[PDB]
Write a protein that binds this ligand. Sequence first.
Ligand SMILES: CN[C@@H]1[C@H](O[C@H]2[C@H](O[C@H]3[C@H](O)[C@@H](O)[C@H](NC(=N)N)[C@@H](O)[C@@H]3NC(=N)N)O[C@@H](C)[C@]2(O)C=O)O[C@@H](CO)[C@H](O)[C@H]1O
Ligand SMILES: Nc1ncnc2c1ncn2[C@@H]1O[C@H](COP(=O)(O)OP(=O)(O)OP(=O)(O)O)[C@@H](O)[C@H]1O
Ligand SMILES: [Cl-]
Ligand SMILES: [Mg+2]
Ligand SMILES: [Mg+2]
Length: 262
Amino acid sequence: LSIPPSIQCQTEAACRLITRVTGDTLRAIHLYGSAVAGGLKPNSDIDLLVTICQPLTEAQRATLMQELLALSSPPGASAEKRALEVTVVLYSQLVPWCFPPSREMQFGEWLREDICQGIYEPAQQDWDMVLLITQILETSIPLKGERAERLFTPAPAAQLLKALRYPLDLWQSTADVQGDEYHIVLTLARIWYTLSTGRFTSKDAAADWLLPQLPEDYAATLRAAQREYLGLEQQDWHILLPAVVRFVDFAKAHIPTQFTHH
Ligand SMILES: CN[C@@H]1[C@H](O[C@H]2[C@H](O[C@H]3[C@H](O)[C@@H](O)[C@H](NC(=N)N)[C@@H](O)[C@@H]3NC(=N)N)O[C@@H](C)[C@]2(O)C=O)O[C@@H](CO)[C@H](O)[C@H]1O
Ligand SMILES: Nc1ncnc2c1ncn2[C@@H]1O[C@H](COP(=O)(O)OP(=O)(O)OP(=O)(O)O)[C@@H](O)[C@H]1O
Ligand SMILES: [Cl-]
Ligand SMILES: [Mg+2]
Ligand SMILES: [Mg+2]
């Protein structure tokens, strides 16, 4: 797998920073997500997983958070300077697996306001870490350390199922989805795709896979979500919000409850 030339400079800067702060504790840095698996759009972020051996000191946490702010920009602000998402995890949480796994920290542009004031999310449980590692074992590039298949072990299918279906419970009310309308719709398409095929695919490809299988009313909602993500039309998602809720409820009712495996 290859790093897109148009992100190499920023990725190299992020790696030099991570190396400085972590240093002796650093086990690996893996690039994953659309930059590697495909689907890198103008607003897409650069997804990075940092594996360390010991927890981050609050000095390391503060420094890494602050200095990442200078290497990252909000999505869409710049074609050259993309949004960074850096997730840090203890190796001991993955080998052997701890369920749910915990993450030491997660930098992201949606936290810029808080990070600009010394407010850092602490370590916490995150079922999504099961999905991250699973996707990394399939499609990732080691910027530092060993390839993923030599560092991590796959999770049991039983736990991958729980991680895939866990977000379905977070989305129940209008406010649970308000603000992330098309992101949630496309993510549901990816969850549906993975549970039915055992594979991971891009947001765009998951929507195309799902559209023919939906009643037209729900296909229209998925189409509007896909259309916005691709930059072809911005919708008024306050108007579409009742239809988004109906789409979420349809997915929760129809997504498989067991693998049709990875
Ligand atoms: C970790 N990736 C970022 C994060 O994504 C999250 C995103 O999570 C969002 C929930 O759906 C939404 O209901 C939730 N909204 C509520 N009313 N509770 C958001 O707060 C939540 N975002 C968050 N905690 N950062 O949906 C999940 C499927 C996700 O992709 C997990 O990995 O947050 C998204 C923005 O919310 C960013 O666009 C992503 O880059
Ligand atoms: N079935 C799934 N397939 C892929 N990702 C999933 C799935 N279910 C949940 N997710 C989560 O959704 C998030 C997607 O991250 P992200 O928004 O960076 O997507 P991406 O593929 O990098 O596309 P983009 O170019 O928009 O960044 C991840 O945190 C991932 O764990
Ligand atoms: Cl329904
Ligand atoms: Mg991404
Ligand atoms: Mg991301």
